[PDB]
Every structure is written in structure tokens, then in C-alpha cells.
Amino acid sequence: SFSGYLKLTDNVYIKNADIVEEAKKVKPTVVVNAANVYLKHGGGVAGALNKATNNAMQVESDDYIATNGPLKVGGSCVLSGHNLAKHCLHVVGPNVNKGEDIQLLKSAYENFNQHEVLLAPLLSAGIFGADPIHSLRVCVDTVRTNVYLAVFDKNLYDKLVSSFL
Numbered sequence: 001s002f003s004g005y006l007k008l009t010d011n012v013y014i015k016n017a018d019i020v021e022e023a024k025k026v027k028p029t030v031v032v033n034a035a036n037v038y039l040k041h042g043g044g045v046a047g048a049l050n051k052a053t054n055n056a057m058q059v060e061s062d063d064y065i066a067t068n069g070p071l072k073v074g075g076s077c078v079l080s081g082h083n084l085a086k087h088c089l090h091v092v093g094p095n096v097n098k099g100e101d102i103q104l105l106k107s108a109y110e111n112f113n114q115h116e117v118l119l120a121p122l123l124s125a126g127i128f129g130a131d132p133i134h135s136l137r138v139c140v141d142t143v144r145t146n147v148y149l150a151v152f153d154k155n156l157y158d159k160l161v162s163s164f165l
């Protein structure tokens with residue numbers, strides 16, 4: 001199972017790790033994708049997870065969108081985890097670079113509560129434009145299930161741990 005994590009709270013754990021490499025190693029029941037409403041996995045975590053599936057995630061996602069239409073900002077859907085996990089929970093955090101309401105970040109993290117344990121990135125961080133320190137705070141104050149956070153950047157990981165209240 002999960003190794004080398006720092007325990008932040010009763011249920012939140014954090015590690016400086018590449019979430020693709022972490023998913024390939026652990027093969028968790030659920031890996032969270034930092035999705036957009038269209039499930040267009042172009043960059044950031046989504047681009048990396050999709051590339052690790054050899055584009056199978058994007059093909060499955062395009063069929064999901066063709067059937068169901070776009071997700072809501074703050075929403076999610078469960079799709080296959082392909083070669084990375086049993087399932088992928090595609091969660092849409094607000095993209096500050098698109099002018100989306102940061103208050104939807106709590107709604108986005110509430111999707112994690114439907115799964116007992118997840119491997120996840122910080123929602124709305126990175127190319128989504130939000131402050132990762134704030135994202136971690138909302139995560140610990142919203143998620144009650146066991147969440148193993150993978151933070152790609154070592155420098156950001158150190159800043160998140162050193163500033164954690």
C-alpha cells in the first residue's frame with residue numbers, strides 16, 4: 001500500500017511524488033484526476049495521467065462526454081483507472097485562470113468523501129491557478145476519508161509541510 005507519506009491529520013497524508021509514478025507503483029483503488037468540465041486531459045495532472053494510459057483515458061472520456069455532456073465545476077465522475085488504478089475519479093476544481101469561483105473548491109473536495117481511500121493531487125493547484133496552501137487547507141477541512149496527496153514539486157511540498165497549521 002502507500003509508503004513514505006507524512007501524516008498531516010487523522011485522514012490526510014502527503015508525499016513529494018509524481019502521481020503517475022505513485023499510481024503505477026501502488027495501483028490504488030482510486031486515483032483522482034484534476035479534470036476540467038470537458039474531460040480534455042491536455043496538461044498538468046490530467047495530461048500526465050492520460051499519457052500514462054496511452055490516451056485510453058481520453059478515448060473513454062470523449063465517449064463519456066458524448067453521452068452525458070460536460071461535468072459541473074465542483075463535480076466529478078468515476079471512470080476506469082486503466083493501468084494506473086481500479087478507478088479514476090475525475091474531479092473538477094475551479095480554474096482561477098478561467099475566473100471560476102474559488103468557493104467551489106470545497107464542493108470539489110466533497111467528491112472525495114464518496115471513496116474510502118484515494119490517491120490525489122491538490123485540487124485547483126498548478127495550472128488551475130489557485131494557492132496550493134489554501135487547497136491543502138480546504139482538503140483537510142473537507143475530506144473525511146483517507147486521502148494520500150501527491151505533490152510533484154519538491155519545493156512546494158516543503159512549503160506545504162512547513163506552513164501546515
Ligand SMILES: COc1cccc([C@H]2CCOC[C@H]2C(=O)O)c1
Pocket residue numbers: 018019020044045048121122123124125126127132150151152153156
Ligand atoms: C504530474 O502532476 C503534476 C505535475 C506538475 C504540477 C502538478 C500540480 C498538481 C496540483 O498541485 C500542485 C502541483 C504539484 O503537485 O506540484 C502536478
